[PDB]
Amino acid sequence: NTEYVAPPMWEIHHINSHSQCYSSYSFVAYHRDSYENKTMQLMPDDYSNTHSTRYVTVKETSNLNCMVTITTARSKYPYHFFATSTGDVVDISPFYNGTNRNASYFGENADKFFIFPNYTIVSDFGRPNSALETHRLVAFLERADSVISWDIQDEKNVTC
């Protein structure tokens, strides 16, 4: 029996900064050898879908893997929700930053939504070392099984 768990937020930050994932998701489920706190790199993995660019780690026991999929999402006017390729319908306006909630929609769980200004993200997850890139606003949302992220952009500058 396989289950899915959303990485803890600190793990998300570690992956964004170093492309290194920590094992032993918290109760604990060790991947192998019962040791933990090992910075494991993410491999480019094998192509699955024309859009997904999945980066995995593994490539009565319990096996733990750590995936970072860069999918594509779409939204329609007036941009009150967006749906990724693998389902994942989110009731958050893609251009909703952290001030314009009366000019954009936001209906997801307010206790699981985080926006970080000037966030640093590795250019490529596959490469063990990459040139860190700064983004004006990056929004994170924690779900039951995964955590979604998406750069926030001005509405009147990308939509016509």
Partner: peptide, 5 residues
């Protein structure tokens, strides 16, 4: 909803 429940 099924997934996130």
């Amino acid at each position: 909803s099924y997934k996130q429940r």
